[PDB]
Design an enzyme around this catalytic site. Structure first.
Site, short mmCIF file in Angstrom:
data_model
loop_
_atom_site.label_atom_id
_atom_site.label_comp_id
_atom_site.label_asym_id
_atom_site.label_seq_id
_atom_site.Cartn_x
_atom_site.Cartn_y
_atom_site.Cartn_z
N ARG A 1 -11.11 -7.98 -15.08
CA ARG A 1 -12.22 -7.24 -15.75
C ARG A 1 -13.05 -8.22 -16.59
O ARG A 1 -12.57 -9.25 -17.02
CB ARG A 1 -11.60 -6.15 -16.63
CG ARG A 1 -12.35 -6.03 -17.96
CD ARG A 1 -11.79 -4.86 -18.76
NE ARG A 1 -11.85 -3.62 -17.94
CZ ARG A 1 -11.41 -2.49 -18.42
NH1 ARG A 1 -10.91 -2.45 -19.63
NH2 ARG A 1 -11.45 -1.41 -17.70
N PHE B 1 -17.73 -9.72 -25.95
CA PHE B 1 -16.29 -9.59 -26.30
C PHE B 1 -15.49 -10.73 -25.67
O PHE B 1 -15.21 -11.73 -26.31
CB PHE B 1 -15.76 -8.25 -25.79
CG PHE B 1 -16.35 -7.13 -26.62
CD1 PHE B 1 -17.58 -6.57 -26.26
CD2 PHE B 1 -15.66 -6.66 -27.74
CE1 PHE B 1 -18.12 -5.53 -27.03
CE2 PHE B 1 -16.20 -5.62 -28.51
CZ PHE B 1 -17.43 -5.06 -28.15
N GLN C 1 -11.34 -10.89 -19.36
CA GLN C 1 -9.86 -10.84 -19.18
C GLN C 1 -9.51 -11.20 -17.73
O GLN C 1 -9.94 -10.55 -16.80
CB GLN C 1 -9.36 -9.43 -19.48
CG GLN C 1 -7.83 -9.41 -19.42
CD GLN C 1 -7.33 -8.00 -19.76
OE1 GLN C 1 -8.10 -7.15 -20.15
NE2 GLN C 1 -6.06 -7.72 -19.62
N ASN D 1 -1.25 -11.49 -26.41
CA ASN D 1 0.14 -11.15 -26.81
C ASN D 1 0.14 -9.80 -27.51
O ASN D 1 -0.39 -9.65 -28.60
CB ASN D 1 0.68 -12.21 -27.76
CG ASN D 1 0.58 -13.59 -27.12
OD1 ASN D 1 0.89 -13.76 -25.96
ND2 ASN D 1 0.16 -14.60 -27.83
N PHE E 1 -7.19 -14.20 -22.21
CA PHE E 1 -8.63 -13.82 -22.24
C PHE E 1 -9.45 -15.00 -22.79
O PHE E 1 -8.93 -15.88 -23.43
CB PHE E 1 -8.82 -12.61 -23.15
CG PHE E 1 -8.48 -12.98 -24.57
CD1 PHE E 1 -7.15 -12.93 -25.01
CD2 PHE E 1 -9.49 -13.39 -25.45
CE1 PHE E 1 -6.83 -13.28 -26.33
CE2 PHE E 1 -9.17 -13.74 -26.77
CZ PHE E 1 -7.84 -13.68 -27.21
N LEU F 1 -11.79 -9.01 -34.12
CA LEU F 1 -10.62 -9.54 -33.35
C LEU F 1 -9.76 -10.41 -34.26
O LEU F 1 -8.87 -11.11 -33.81
CB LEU F 1 -11.11 -10.37 -32.17
CG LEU F 1 -12.11 -9.56 -31.33
CD1 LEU F 1 -12.16 -10.16 -29.93
CD2 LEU F 1 -11.67 -8.10 -31.21
N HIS G 1 -3.30 -14.55 -33.25
CA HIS G 1 -3.74 -15.05 -31.91
C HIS G 1 -3.22 -16.48 -31.71
O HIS G 1 -2.98 -17.19 -32.66
CB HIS G 1 -5.27 -15.05 -31.84
CG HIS G 1 -5.78 -13.64 -31.99
ND1 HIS G 1 -5.60 -12.68 -31.01
CD2 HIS G 1 -6.46 -13.02 -33.01
CE1 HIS G 1 -6.16 -11.54 -31.45
NE2 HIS G 1 -6.70 -11.70 -32.66
#
Length: 178
Positions: A68, A73, A76, A115, A126, A135, A139
């Site tokens: 996708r 953003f 992915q 994760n 991603f 976000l 990470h």
């Protein structure tokens, strides 16, 4: 002795094409210090040093399509085994604690393993082509983007909030530059 025989600076690149014509080349840099095991996960599957499983399960990221895509953003990707979550085989097998992520994404073009919880290999990953604030959370970064910014935008412009690319996107091939 002129050559130490060590490759602490491994490089990997993916050839992406759209529809039925070449798009461009994307080169990314892997860190062999803070997170070297992660660089091996891509270098091994990309080059395929492990080889294909005798049962019949080629370990290559060639001929793979992005699951996708989303502009602003992040895009992915998916595992070549399927990408629906059911697939996704890793050489590590059992999961292991995630290495501390002292480094963070100061700008766009940073690779990070997804994760859902701590101590998770993060089979899914991603790419963030833009700086985001919502976000902000736990990470992990294992690589950075050095080139391919011209084509990375091409994947997002054809992308949409729906999460589907307008044109077909597939990697013509994958391997280790050095």
């Amino acid at each position: 002795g002129s050559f130490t025989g060590s490759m602490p600076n491994p490089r990997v690149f993916f050839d992406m094409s759209v529809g039925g014509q070449p798009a461009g080349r994307i080169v990314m840099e892997l860190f062999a210090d803070t997170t070297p095991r992660t660089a091996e996960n891509f270098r091994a599957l990309c080059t395929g040093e492990k080889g294909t499983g005798r049962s019949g399960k080629p370990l290559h990221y060639k001929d793979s399509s992005f699951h996708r895509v989303i502009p602003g953003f992040m895009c992915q990707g998916g595992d070549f085994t399927a990408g629906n979550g059911t697939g996704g085989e890793s050489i590590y097998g059992a999961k292991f604690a995630d290495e501390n992520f002292i480094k963070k994404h100061t700008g766009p073009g940073i690779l990070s393993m997804a994760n859902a919880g701590p101590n998770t290999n993060g089979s899914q990953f991603f790419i963030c082509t833009a700086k985001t604030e919502w976000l902000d959370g736990k990470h992990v970064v294992f690589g950075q983007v050095v080139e391919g910014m011209d084509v990375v935008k091409a994947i997002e412009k054809v992308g949409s909030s729906s999460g589907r690319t307008a044109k077909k996107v597939v990697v013509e091939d994958c391997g280790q530059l050095s």
